[PDB]
């Protein structure tokens, strides 16, 4: 239980996952501020509570917010992951049967937590037609939604996908608090080794020659979302500089722009790539994971949910650097749900 | 309203934020190192509390004009002359206000410059030079500095502009307007959000304002902007809070667009007139929401004995990430380096 940090690699990528492990000093530490916030705030995403929440975090351990300052400025990470926060398992009481019923009294604590390590990465974000609206969304197995393609999905794998690939709000992070993984359940991830890859295909990815369509898990706006998949505008699968790319794709969304086989080539190729480089981040009771969705796809594998209250339960949200880009398709200026207008 | 938030500190909160600036001068040699760049935004972090809760408020404000942070600590006699020209202007007894101005500039974003603009620091200098009296450049005196969004014509354009006044004796002003699309027509509006104008690059980009041994090939893309800009939009986002982007000197509608080129002379006149002065006396620090307002500079006459006005100023992205094609490494701040 003493601090400590560094860079796990995955294949060719040297800096794939930053781990940070707390002290325990460190973890009681995060523990008060967020027990405090959760006294003087009404919610983990209440307006008064996101308007102070950059600076709260502020009040986070020095030594956690330098090496969490260090992934927010690295172009390759895949995953930052935090572990030895404090989850008091009693206190917390079960998995809940639906996300409807997962915003208990006894959970605010850790989407309080949640929200103040996101925001030292950049600005909360939600989604109008995702769990309500919420910015803090909650990561459980529903009774007869074991083969949904959903994540309340359970026997059956969560294909993998950059996270909102068809929208340009898609977020810069996705945050996952674990409350408890008895089964030490994994979350997949990849990301493109170019090094791996015909530099042809590359150059094809690079180019806007791709559909990426929305899930059906998706007025202005949603006069935008019907166009996606009726008319959906032609985009690139890579971005950006070539010694860094950005990388937005879907598994089960994605196909090349009508009658270029060249592009549908690459596409696959690039399937085939990604599927057989995926690896798994496993999250303990009380570590946070910032998966870098501008470099890595992520998804889940089957696992087997009992449905008695000990299942798998994270906190998730979604962290985007630059908030004011997406003031077009949010409710106000500090309205944090996409598509709420 | 709040457009213009200010922070005036009190003696204790400018000794912190001057005490935390002299450390960083201790530890660093510049204000844009490499290693303080990597250490700016946890270190921006002990800033007076009460201060950053302030900047949070105006960084997260999409109606924001301005935020200015009056009363840091400016020792005049400590400081010396006014140099001559911003390539002299890298003082020893100047770091300090450099090294507070990331810190403040720190908590809005990440700090860049510019490959083409005063030989790619990132900290820059504002300060009125023997033969610019009558030129276009922030370096101008006797010729107003017309009003413009920084770096218009880059879609890596700073979202903030960073001014910390050293020395400002008689009272120039800084001049802002934002753009109230109720005031100018929903038909001028429509017009301005379509692709119909050209923004070249100020001449601040040009060798003929940096270092003479400075690589011919940061200047070509920055030519090649001159010669052949790209059609842009100068109105973007949501209808209710638009961004602004255009340069009073350097904006053209494109060839035959006679719609295009009246709603350009409609917002010419608009932002004209309300054009308005904040004045950054000596230890002020402005943000300018450059996605918000267009700003300028009254004219002065400078006296050129090194008593003249002096700022320090810093670009702030929120989102570094977004430049990365522009850049040569990810921790790399110069825009066109790439
Ligand atoms: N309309 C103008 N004068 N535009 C250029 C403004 C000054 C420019 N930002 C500079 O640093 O020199
Ligand atoms: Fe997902
Ligand atoms: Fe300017």
Not at 113 to 116: A, F, I, K, S
Not at 195 to 199: N, R, S, T, W
């Given at each position: 239980?003493?601090?400590?940090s560094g860079?796990?690699?995955?294949?060719?990528?040297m800096?794939?996952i930053?781990?940070?492990?707390?002290?325990?000093?460190?973890?009681?530490?995060?523990?008060?501020?967020?027990?405090e916030?959760?006294?003087?705030?009404?919610?983990?995403?209440?307006?008064?509570?996101?308007?102070?929440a950059?600076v709260l975090?502020?009040?986070?351990?020095?030594?956690?917010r330098?090496?969490?300052?260090?992934?927010?400025?690295?172009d390759?990470?895949?995953?930052?992951?935090?572990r030895g926060?404090?989850?008091?398992?009693?206190?917390?009481?079960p998995?809940?049967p639906?996300?409807?019923?997962?915003?208990?009294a006894?959970?605010?604590?850790?989407?309080f937590?949640?929200?103040?390590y996101?925001?030292?990465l950049?600005?909360v974000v939600?989604?109008?037609?995702?769990?309500?609206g919420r910015?803090?969304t909650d990561?459980?197995?529903?009774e007869?939604?074991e083969?949904s393609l959903?994540?309340?999905?359970?026997?059956?794998?969560?294909?993998w996908?950059?996270?909102?690939?068809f929208?340009?709000?898609?977020?810069?992070?996705?945050?996952?608090?674990?409350?408890?993984?008895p089964?030490?359940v994994?979350?997949?991830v990849?990301?493109?080794?170019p090094?791996?890859?015909?530099?042809a295909?590359?150059?094809?990815?690079?180019?806007e020659?791709?559909?990426?369509?929305?899930?059906?898990?998706?007025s202005?706006?949603?006069?935008?979302?019907?166009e996606?998949?009726?008319?959906?505008?032609?985009?690139?699968?890579?971005?950006?500089?070539?010694?860094?790319?950005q990388?937005?794709?879907?598994?089960?969304?994605?196909?090349?722009?009508?009658?270029d086989?060249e592009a549908?080539?690459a596409?696959d190729?690039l399937?085939?790539?990604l599927?057989?480089?995926?690896?798994?981040?496993?999250?303990?009771?009380?570590?946070?994971?910032?998966?870098d969705?501008?470099?890595v796809?992520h998804?889940?594998?089957?696992?087997?949910?009992?449905?008695d209250?000990?299942?798998?339960?994270?906190?998730?949200?979604?962290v985007?650097?630059?908030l004011?880009?997406?003031?077009?398709?949010?409710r106000?200026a500090?309205?944090?749900?996409?598509?709420?207008?």
């Open positions: 239980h003493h601090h400590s860079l796990v690699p995955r294949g060719s990528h800096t794939a930053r781990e940070i492990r707390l002290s325990e000093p460190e973890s009681a530490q995060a523990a008060l501020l967020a027990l916030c959760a006294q003087r705030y009404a919610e983990p995403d209440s307006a008064d509570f996101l308007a102070d950059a975090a502020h009040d986070l351990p020095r030594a956690v330098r090496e969490v300052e260090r992934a927010r400025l690295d390759r990470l895949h995953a930052l992951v935090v926060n404090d989850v008091d398992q009693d206190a917390l009481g998995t809940p639906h996300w409807r019923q997962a915003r208990t006894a959970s605010r604590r850790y989407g937590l949640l929200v103040l996101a925001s030292l950049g600005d939600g989604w109008a037609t995702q769990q309500d910015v803090v990561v459980l197995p529903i007869g939604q083969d959903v994540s309340s999905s359970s026997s059956v794998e969560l294909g996908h950059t996270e909102d690939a929208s340009p709000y898609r977020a810069d992070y996705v945050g996952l608090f674990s409350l408890r993984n089964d030490s994994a979350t997949t990849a990301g493109l080794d090094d791996l890859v015909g530099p295909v590359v150059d094809v990815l690079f180019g020659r791709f559909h990426i369509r929305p899930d059906n898990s998706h202005d706006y949603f006069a935008g979302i019907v996606a998949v009726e008319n959906p505008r032609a985009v690139s699968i890579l971005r950006g500089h070539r010694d860094a790319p990388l937005c794709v879907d598994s089960d969304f994605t196909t090349a722009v009508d009658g086989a549908a080539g596409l190729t399937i085939k790539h599927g057989g480089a995926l690896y798994e981040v496993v999250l303990g009771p009380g570590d946070v994971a910032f998966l969705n501008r470099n796809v998804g889940r594998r089957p696992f087997r949910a009992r449905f209250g000990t299942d798998r339960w994270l906190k998730r949200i979604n985007t650097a630059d004011r880009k997406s003031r077009a398709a949010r106000d500090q309205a944090r749900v996409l598509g709420e207008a």
